[PDB]
Amino acid sequence: APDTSVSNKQNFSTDVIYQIFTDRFSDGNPANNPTGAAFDGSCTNLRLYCGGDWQGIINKINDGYLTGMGITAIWISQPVENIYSVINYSGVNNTAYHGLWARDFKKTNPAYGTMQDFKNLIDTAHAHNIKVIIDFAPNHTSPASSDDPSFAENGRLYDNGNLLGGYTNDTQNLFHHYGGTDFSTIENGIYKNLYDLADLNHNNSSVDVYLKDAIKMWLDLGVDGIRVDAVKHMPFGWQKSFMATINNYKPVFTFGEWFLGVNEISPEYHQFANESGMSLLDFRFAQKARQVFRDNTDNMYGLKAMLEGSEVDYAQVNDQVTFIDNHDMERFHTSNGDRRKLEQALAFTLTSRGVPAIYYGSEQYMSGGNDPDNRARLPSFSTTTTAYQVIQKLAPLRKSNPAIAYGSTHERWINNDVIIYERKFGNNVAVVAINRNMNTPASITGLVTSLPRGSYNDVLGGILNGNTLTVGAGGAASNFTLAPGGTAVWQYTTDATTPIIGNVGPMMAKPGVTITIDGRGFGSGKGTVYFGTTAVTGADIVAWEDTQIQVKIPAVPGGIYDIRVANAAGAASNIYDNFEVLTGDQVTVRFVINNATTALGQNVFLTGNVSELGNWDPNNAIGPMYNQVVYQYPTWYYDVSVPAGQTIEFKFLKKQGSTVTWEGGANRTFTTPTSGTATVNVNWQP
Numbered sequence: 001a002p003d004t005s006v007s008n009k010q011n012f013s014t015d016v017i018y019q020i021f022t023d024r025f026s027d028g029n030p031a032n033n034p035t036g037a038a039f040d041g042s043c044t045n046l047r048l049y050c051g052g053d054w055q056g057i058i059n060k061i062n063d064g065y066l067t068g069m070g071i072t073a074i075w076i077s078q079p080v081e082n083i084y085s086v087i088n089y090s091g092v093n094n095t096a097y098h099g100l101w102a103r104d105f106k107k108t109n110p111a112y113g114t115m116q117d118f119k120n121l122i123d124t125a126h127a128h129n130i131k132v133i134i135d136f137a138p139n140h141t142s143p144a145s146s147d148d149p150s151f152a153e154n155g156r157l158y159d160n161g162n163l164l165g166g167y168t169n170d171t172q173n174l175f176h177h178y179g180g181t182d183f184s185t186i187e188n189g190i191y192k193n194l195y196d197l198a199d200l201n202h203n204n205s206s207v208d209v210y211l212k213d214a215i216k217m218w219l220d221l222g223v224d225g226i227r228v229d230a231v232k233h234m235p236f237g238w239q240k241s242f243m244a245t246i247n248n249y250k251p252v253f254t255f256g257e258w259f260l261g262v263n264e265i266s267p268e269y270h271q272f273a274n275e276s277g278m279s280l281l282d283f284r285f286a287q288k289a290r291q292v293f294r295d296n297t298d299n300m301y302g303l304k305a306m307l308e309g310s311e312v313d314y315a316q317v318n319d320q321v322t323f324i325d326n327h328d329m330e331r332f333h334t335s336n337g338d339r340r341k342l343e344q345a346l347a348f349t350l351t352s353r354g355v356p357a358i359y360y361g362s363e364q365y366m367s368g369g370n371d372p373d374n375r376a377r378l379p380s381f382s383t384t385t386t387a388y389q390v391i392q393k394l395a396p397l398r399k400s401n402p403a404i405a406y407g408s409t410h411e412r413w414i415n416n417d418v419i420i421y422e423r424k425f426g427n428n429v430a431v432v433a434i435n436r437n438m439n440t441p442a443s444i445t446g447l448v449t450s451l452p453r454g455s456y457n458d459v460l461g462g463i464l465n466g467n468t469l470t471v472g473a474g475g476a477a478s479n480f481t482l483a484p485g486g487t488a489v490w491q492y493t494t495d496a497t498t499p500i501i502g503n504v505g506p507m508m509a510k511p512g513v514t515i516t517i518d519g520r521g522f523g524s525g526k527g528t529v530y531f532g533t534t535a536v537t538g539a540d541i542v543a544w545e546d547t548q549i550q551v552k553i554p555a556v557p558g559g560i561y562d563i564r565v566a567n568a569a570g571a572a573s574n575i576y577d578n579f580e581v582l583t584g585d586q587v588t589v590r591f592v593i594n595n596a597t598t599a600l601g602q603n604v605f606l607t608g609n610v611s612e613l614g615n616w617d618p619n620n621a622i623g624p625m626y627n628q629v630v631y632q633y634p635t636w637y638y639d640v641s642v643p644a645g646q647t648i649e650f651k652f653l654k655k656q657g658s659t660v661t662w663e664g665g666a667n668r669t670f671t672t673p674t675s676g677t678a679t680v681n682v683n684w685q686p
């Protein structure tokens, strides 16, 4: 099927995501509304249920409100059954309107709708070619106090009705009991409790297995994507095994949230996006866009930089979800500011690279500070606001113009307040000009583009004050003045004669799994896919078409491969690097080493003979290991994702600068379990 098909759950670059807070969208059914001091039908107290439900979105999909806007994917609240407690955090009552206080990952939250209400939703969405992404928060359950088992629901957890246990009297060790985090370190913020949320222990097989069976159930119901909450507060090694489980079953576009601030850029943030098996929410985009288009704390050369720095730092930049604001930051639109800033910021996000995400209510100029302020109810549904129009005219370009979805970015003209950039994928082009200045016009002299001779009409139709572009000979355009706050989008689309890859999903799976390659130029008849030097053809290619090829991963040794395509006429595509074929199914193993004495600047790492363990290369060793919470120095520990049911070999090492110190003795061997978890306890051998 084509790359734009609703059946394409692996990739979302050609989609526009509408982020909804079920509760604060539309109450399509009152019979299911919570009652008592948990309900606030006037959405006056923003920490209470307002009544929104799934039937409320089915209504907005049916009467054409969402569809008429151009949206092709809704991202909703956690569908999982929550605690029913009305928590009075010092004077203020609080409820689980946000879906983030899980109670039973196998049942739906009654207030949002029933199991039948969920199928209806998946079916009304798909029948209108809209994809559904859900939230999943496997890092915890709900507010719990072990000292006072009378608080909330005591962080209890049920398995489809059966109680597994609570935060008080945890003999089975389902949770962590190390106090709460002060966010001092990454280690600290992972094993310690986030504020007061009963932190789950994934080293416990019962927990590990339960969360994995839970996500599959949700995959079986029809979801097309997953947004995992708090990726920074769970162990990396477990997440990889959680991903390998999704991808090895029914892969869906999965992404997670890792909050970055202003001009804050961490390498762990990138390492996660590059090696977890899942992408992140592009906070590097969001904060930079708001600095230039909103707070005006940086100029266009910072925008240029960011767009360029990203095209390299991320391994698969086309998979990062972009946005201008959301549930974790103040609303982009202010009181003392004009709607133009918002109108432009939206256009910039819509034509830029990644998976664009619009936080509900942005098209109705909703204003509001931090939580719960940024989570008020959508005041209206007027399909005639300019912002509605902008999204309306731009959104479908992602599915029609391959350059918007997969193309590279090139700044063709730049200034302190104006930028003109090009997105191109083969012959397809899209030029976007923006003058953020509202006072002075911008005379553009000598603008060269990839557009062929012609005079292109603004796709925005002038509502953003955009002109038409007369492109003469050599892609050069006649001079023009870009009006203050002007914005224009010009484009060109044509067939692809050369195979070209725009994206691949999933980015890691075991042999025998079907991956999805998307692009243009693949051709009608079956061709050839290269995983490294290993060529795949015949029955192993499940599907071939001009825009999308589906092929099984061949039996190769685990490791990183470069993907490449060749049509039936030997025309080979560009290289799509960084594909991880795993050794097989994964399980998480905690490795604990005792007596590793280290110097100031020396850390302990691990390595072994399978690719998930770096394949003996000390530059790809797992680490630096942990040494303060679950175990303290001189004992180090780490949760690592390894192949299931195999005898792996490994040795620990110390690393300091360019100096590496290996353990003495013989290689350690270990037979991994087929499911669940395992813990290896050892002592440093000199």
Ligand SMILES: C[C@H]1O[C@H](O[C@H]2[C@H](O)[C@@H](O)[C@@H](O[C@H]3[C@H](O)[C@@H](O)[C@H](O)O[C@@H]3CO)O[C@@H]2CO)[C@H](O)[C@@H](O)[C@@H]1N[C@H]1C=C(CO)[C@@H](O)[C@H](O)[C@H]1O
Binding pocket: 098, 100, 183, 194, 195, 197, 229, 230, 233, 259, 327, 328, 329, 330, 370, 371
């Ligand atoms: C509140 C939020 O905090 C934890 O994770 C991140 C946030 O996602 C991140 O945005 C940042 O928090 C705020 C930031 O400090 C502030 O300067 C900025 O203006 O806005 C941010 C959002 O408020 O930093 C923290 C990490 O230090 C949790 O991991 C998130 O899950 C949490 N949001 C969840 C959690 C709870 C639990 O109480 C819900 O109450 C909340 O509604 C839900 O969204």
Ligand SMILES: [Ca+2]
Binding pocket: 027, 028, 029, 030, 031, 032, 033, 051, 052, 053, 111
């Ligand atoms: Ca309701």
Ligand SMILES: [Ca+2]
Binding pocket: 139, 189, 190, 191, 192, 199, 200, 233, 234, 235
């Ligand atoms: Ca945790």
